[PDB]
Amino acid sequence: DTAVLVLAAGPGTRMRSDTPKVLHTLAGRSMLSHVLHAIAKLAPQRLIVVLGHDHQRIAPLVGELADTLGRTIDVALQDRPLGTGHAVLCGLSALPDDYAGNVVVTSGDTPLLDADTLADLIATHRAVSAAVTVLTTTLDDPFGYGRILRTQDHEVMAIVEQTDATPSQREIREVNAGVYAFDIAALRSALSRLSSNNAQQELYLTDVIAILRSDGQTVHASHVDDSALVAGVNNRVQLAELASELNRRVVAAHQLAGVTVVDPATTWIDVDVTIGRDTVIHPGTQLLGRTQIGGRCVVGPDTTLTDVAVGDGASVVRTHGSSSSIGDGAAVGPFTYLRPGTALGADGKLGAFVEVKNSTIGTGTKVPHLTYVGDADIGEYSNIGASSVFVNRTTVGSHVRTGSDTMFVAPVTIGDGAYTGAGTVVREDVPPGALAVSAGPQRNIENWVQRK
Amino acid sequence: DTAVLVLAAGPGTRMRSDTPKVLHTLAGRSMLSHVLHAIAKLAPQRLIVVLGHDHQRIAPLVGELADTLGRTIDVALQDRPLGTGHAVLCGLSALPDDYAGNVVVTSGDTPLLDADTLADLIATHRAVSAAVTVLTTTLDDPFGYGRILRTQDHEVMAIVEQTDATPSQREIREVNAGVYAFDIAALRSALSRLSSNNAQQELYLTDVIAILRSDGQTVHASHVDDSALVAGVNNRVQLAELASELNRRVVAAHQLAGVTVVDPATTWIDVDVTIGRDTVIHPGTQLLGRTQIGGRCVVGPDTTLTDVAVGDGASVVRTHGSSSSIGDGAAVGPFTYLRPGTALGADGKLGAFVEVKNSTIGTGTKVPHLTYVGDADIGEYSNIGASSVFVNRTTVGSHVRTGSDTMFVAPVTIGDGAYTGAGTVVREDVPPGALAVSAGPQRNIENWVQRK
Amino acid sequence: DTAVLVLAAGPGTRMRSDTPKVLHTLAGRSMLSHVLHAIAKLAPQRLIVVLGHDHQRIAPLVGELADTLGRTIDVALQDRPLGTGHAVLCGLSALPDDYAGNVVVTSGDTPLLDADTLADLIATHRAVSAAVTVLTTTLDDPFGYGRILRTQDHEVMAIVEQTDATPSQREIREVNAGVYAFDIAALRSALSRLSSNNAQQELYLTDVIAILRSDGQTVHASHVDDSALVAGVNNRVQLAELASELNRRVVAAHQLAGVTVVDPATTWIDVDVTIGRDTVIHPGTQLLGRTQIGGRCVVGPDTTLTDVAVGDGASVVRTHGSSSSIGDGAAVGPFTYLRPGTALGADGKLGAFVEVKNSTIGTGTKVPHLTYVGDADIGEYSNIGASSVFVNRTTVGSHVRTGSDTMFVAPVTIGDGAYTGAGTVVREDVPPGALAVSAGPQRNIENWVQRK
C-alpha cells in the first residue's frame, strides 16, 4: 500500500516565465503530465499533488489528467513556498491521520522518471526495511543538485544543497534525485524537527536524511545508473537538454521498430506519435501531438505535422500541416500548408504553393500549383488548374478539369466531368460536362513596343 | 595474390525492413556499394560476394557495380543463413579447389571500411606470417560486438559473441571488427571443425580464432584506432549514427578544401558531390546524388538539391530541386521548386513561390514571383510577370516582358521584344514587338458598398 | 598602463579563402571584430593592430570599428609574414621608443577571448612580477597548438610548435593560448635574439619563452580552464566548431533570461539579437544581425530573420525576412518572404506564399494568400484577396476588401471602404466605397465535353 506525493507548488523563479514551471512542455506533454502518467502506471493507492500560487491555473489540468488516466488524484494546497519539506507536510494532510502505507515523494520537475524506476524504489525500500530510501545518480556536472554525503563506511550520512555545500563538497558527483520512499511514521517525525536555518532559508526535505540517521534509523541510497531518468529541470537550459535526451530515445524506439530516421538530431517526435514500418523521415522534421504515419511513407525534409493522419505509401515533403488526414499513396509538397479540417483522399496530390483549409478532396484528385482551397468539397479524379482560388461551401464533382487562373466564388456547384477555361471567374453553377468560360478574346496590337 | 569475400547473405532481421539490410543507404550509396568501392580500389585478384534470400534483388545491383568499377565480381550463393562461418564456406566455393592466395573476409554492414585499412591488414598478415589476422578496435559501448579474449601474455585466445559472453566478458571493450585475413589452408581446416552449439545456434566465423589457436597456429590481432572505419550496422540506430559520422567527415573535407559550412551538423553532403572554393553553405541543407556546386556560391538555408549543377557566384536559397542546372551568377529562392529538366541561364532569376519543370530559361531571364513554368523555352533577358502559368511546348523569345496574371496556353510562340498586358490569356502566337491583351476595361460602380 | 597588440597580418593559407582569415564571421561579427570588441571593453591605453598583405582590405574595417567603439586603434604594417615574433616587432614600432607600460599580445584568430580573461592576465602578470605571462589551457585534442614544456618543478621551460614537436611532445595536452603579457624591455630583448631555424622557417613569438627563461627571467603560465575562450581558428573546421560553441552560449544566455529555445542545436542567434521573455523559438531558426524579438512571440520552425523587428505576441513561422518590422500581435507565415522596407502593423497578417517588398501595411490588415505586395502603402483593417499582385506607389485605404485575382497596376489609389471584384485589373483610381470590376460574365457551354 503506497501513497505518492508530487511536489508541484514551488514558484519556479529560475524558469523566468509567466507560465508555471510544471506546465512547460517536452515531446508533447507538460512536465506535470509526464510525471502523473508515470505514477498512474505504477497505480498507487493514493496520488496527491501539492500545488501553490497559481493552483487555480494547474488544478484543472490535474482533474483532466485524473479522468484521462481514469483514477483519483487529490490536490493538497501549500499556501506559501516554505520549502520541499513543508510541501511534503502539506501533502501528508490529504492522507488520513492514521495512514500506514509507504510514502513516495517526487518532484514535478523530474519528467523522465518512469514507472519502473518507481517500482524498483518501492521494492528496495521494502526489502531493506528502510525508514528512508533515496534515489541518487552520478553526474559529470552535478551543479545545483544536493550532494550525497557518505561516511568511510560508504554509508549515507546527509544530503547537502548546492547553495549550502562547501567548495570541496561541490566536487561530489553523486547527487540526490529528489525521489524518495519513506516509512510514514519516520517521515512525520523527521518533518517536525526541520528548521530553516540554511542558505535558502527554507524547510529542506533533504534534511530528513541526516535527522533519521540521528535517530539510528535505516537510511538507504539506491543508485540509478541511467542518470536521465532522474534528471531535474530548474531552468530552460535544463528543460531543452532533457527534451533533447527524451527525443533521442523516442526516435531510437522508432528506428529499432523499423523506421528510418535519417537525422535523429533534427527529427522531433512527440510521445503519442505512431509511425509505420519502412517510413523514411528526412531531416528538419517535427511530428507533433497525435500524428500517425503509416508504412512506407516519405516524410520529406522540413515538414511539421501536428495531429495529422497519413496513410501508407504517402509522400509529405516540406509541408506545414495540422488537424488533417492524407490518404494512402497521396503526394503532398514541397511547400504545402494544410490547415485544420483538410482531408485528402488516397492517391490525391497537393503540390507546391498550395494551401487547403477545411476542405475534403477526393480520391485521385490533384491540386498541383499555386492554389488556395478553402471550405470546399471536391470529388474524385478531378484536376484543379494552377493559380486558382476557392473564394469562400463550393462543391466540385468528379473527373472535373478546371483551367488555370479560375476563381470559384462560393457557393457554387461544378458538375461531374465539367471543365473551366483558363482565367474564368465562376459565380454560377456549371452543369455536368459543361465548359464554363469568361475570359475575353486575345487581341494582338502590332508594333506597340516600337511606339510605346 | 588475394581474394576478398563480402558476406552479404544474412536476413538482416534487426533492421525490421522489407529492404535487404545491405541495400540501406548512407551519403548517397548502399552499404554494399560502399564496401565494394573500397575493395575495388584495393584491386584484389578475386572479389566474391556471398548472397542469400533476395539474391534476386541484390545480384543485379552487384553486376551494375562490377561494370561501374570495371572489374569482375562473382556472386556465391548461400542457400540458408547458417552463420558467418558457413557464409565464408559458401564464398570459398567460387574459388578454385587449389587456390593459394590469401583470403580476406569482411561483412556487407561495415560501410566505412576503406582501401587503406584493408591494405594495412594484408600487410600485417604477410609480415607476421599469420594464419589469421583479425582487425579489432576499442569502444566505449561494445554492445553486440564479439569481444576479444586475451591471455595474460596479451595474446589473442578467442572471440566471444555478445549473446554468448558472460556478464564479466561483456565489459571487455576491445571488439572484433569482423574483418580478417587468412592463410587459405588454415581457413578451410578450421571451417570444417565449426559446430553450432552456441547461443544463436549458428556457425560462427569467429570460432576459427580459438580453433587455429588450438592448432598452435599464429593468430594476430591488429588494432584499428579510428573505430568508425570498422564500425558495424545491425539496426537503424547504428545506421544513422554511422551516417552522421561519415557526413561529418565529408563536410570536414570540404571545409579544409575551402568551403564554409556554417553548421556541419545540419548539412548533409553525399559522397559524390563537389563544391567550389569560397561557397558558403547555410544550415538545414542537403546536397544529394551528383550535385555540383561551383565557387563563391551561397546555398541558403533549408535547400535540398539532388543531381543539380550550379555555376559559380550563384545563390540557391530555400530551394527544393532535382536534375536541373543553374548558371553562373543566377539567383534562385527563397521558396523555389525545381523539377527535373530545369535549365536556368547565367544571371537568371527564379524567385519566391516559383516552380519550373522541364523548361529552359535563357541568360538573364527573371521569373520572380508566384509562377509555374512547365515544358517551355524562354529566351534571354526576358521578364515573366508575377502570378503567371505556362499551361502545358511554348516558346517565348528574348527581351520579352509579360504582364502579371498571364496564362500561356501551350503551344504558343511569343516573339522577341513582345509584351503581354496584366491579366492576359494567351492562346495564340504574339508577333515580335506586339502587345497581346485580353482583359476588359475597369468599371467603377460608385457607392456600391453603401448599397450592398 | 597597457598596450595591446593584435596580430592580424598572417596570410591565412589554411582557410583556403580569397577572404582574409580575420574577416571570416561567426554570430554576426568577423573574428577581428570579436577580438577588438573584447579589447576595447578592457580599455587599454594603446591598441595596435598589425596588418599585412590585404591591409588595404582590412584597415578600413578597423577604422570603422575604432569609431563604433569610440577610441583610437593604430594600424602597424608588417610587409612580409616573417612569423608571429616579427609581427610583434612590427607592432612595437607604433609605440614610442621609450614606452614603459605592459605589452599584451593576442592573435586575430582567437575570437572568444573576452575582456575578463584579458584583465585576469594583466592582473596575474602584475602580481607575480613576471617578465612574460602566457595563457595556457588543456585540450583533449591539442593538434596544431604549441605545447607547454615544463620541468619536474612544474616550471615553464618552453613552447614547442606542432610542426617542431617530437611524437612524444605531441602527446602534451597543455597548450599555448597565444595570449601573453610582457614586461616591454624583456620583450624587446628576447625579440632581438629570435632566429628562424625551425620547421616553418619563421620567427616564432613562442621562442621568447625559452629565451627569457635563459636569462633567469620570471616566466609565468596562467591556466584558462574554460578552453573555448582561448581556442584558435586556423581553418574552416575550427571556425565552425567555435561558431557552434559560441552559439550554444548565446542561446543559453537567452534561455536563462526567459526564452524557450526548443532546439539549441538548430537555433542560430547572432550576438546583437535581443529576445523578450516567454518567446518560444522553434527548430531550424536563424536570428541574424540586429534582429529584435519582443515578448510572448512564436518564431516558428524554419525562419531566418536578419535585422527584423518583431513586437510582442507576434507569430513568425517558416518566414524568410530582412530589414522589416512586424507589429505586436501580427501573424506572418508559414512560407512568407519579407524583403527590405516591409512594415506590417500590429495585428496584421501576411500568410502563406506571400512576398512583400518596400511596402507599409496598416494595423489589422490581412494579405493571407499567394500575393505579391511591392512598393505599396495599404491602410488599416483592409483585406487583400488571394492571388493578387501589386504591379510596380499604389495606395490602398482602410477597410478596403479587394477580390481574389486583382492586379493593381501602379500607380493607383484605392479609397477607403472600396471593394474590387474577383479577377479585376485595376489601372485607375477607385473612389471610396466604390466597387471596381473588369471580369466579363460567366458563359456555360453545355455538352462541350461530350463534343470535344
Ligand SMILES: CC(=O)N[C@H]1[C@@H](OP(=O)(O)OP(=O)(O)OC[C@H]2O[C@@H](n3ccc(=O)[nH]c3=O)[C@H](O)[C@@H]2O)O[C@H](CO)[C@@H](O)[C@@H]1O
Ligand atoms: C532541498 C531539496 O529538496 N532539494 C532537492 C531539489 O532541488 P531543487 O532546487 O531542484 O528543488 P526545487 O526548487 O525544484 O523544488 C522541488 C520541487 O518541489 C516543489 N516545491 C518546492 C518548494 C516549495 O516550497 N514547495 C514545493 O511544492 C516544486 O514544484 C519543485 O518542483 O531537487 C533536486 C533534484 O531535482 C535535488 O538534488 C535536491 O536535493
Ligand SMILES: CC(=O)N[C@H]1[C@@H](OP(=O)(O)OP(=O)(O)OC[C@H]2O[C@@H](n3ccc(=O)[nH]c3=O)[C@H](O)[C@@H]2O)O[C@H](CO)[C@@H](O)[C@@H]1O
Ligand atoms: C559470429 C560473427 O561473425 N560475429 C561478428 C559479426 O556480428 P554481427 O552479429 O554484426 O554479424 P551479422 O549478423 O551482421 O552477420 C555478418 C554479416 O555476414 C553476412 N551473413 C551473416 C549470416 C549468414 O548466415 N550469412 C551471411 O552471409 C550478413 O550479410 C552480415 O552482414 O560482426 C561483428 C562486427 O560487425 C563482430 O563483432 C562479430 O564478431
Ligand SMILES: CC(=O)N[C@H]1[C@@H](OP(=O)(O)OP(=O)(O)OC[C@H]2O[C@@H](n3ccc(=O)[nH]c3=O)[C@H](O)[C@@H]2O)O[C@H](CO)[C@@H](O)[C@@H]1O
Ligand atoms: C609560433 C606561434 O605563434 N604559434 C602559436 C600560434 O599558432 P598558429 O599556427 O595558430 O599561429 P597563426 O599562423 O594563426 O598566426 C598567429 C596570428 O598572428 C598573425 N601573424 C602570423 C604570422 C605573421 O607572420 N604575421 C602575423 O601577423 C596572424 O594574423 C595570426 O592570426 O597560435 C596558437 C594558438 O592559436 C599557439 O598555440 C601557438 O603557440
Ligand SMILES: [Co+2]
Ligand atoms: Co528542481
Ligand SMILES: [Co+2]
Ligand atoms: Co486572372
Ligand SMILES: [Co+2]
Ligand atoms: Co553485423
Ligand SMILES: [Co+2]
Ligand atoms: Co592561429
Ligand SMILES: [Mg+2]
Ligand atoms: Mg525552489
Ligand SMILES: [Mg+2]
Ligand atoms: Mg546475423
Ligand SMILES: [Mg+2]
Ligand atoms: Mg601562420
Ligand SMILES: [Mg+2]
Ligand atoms: Mg491570377
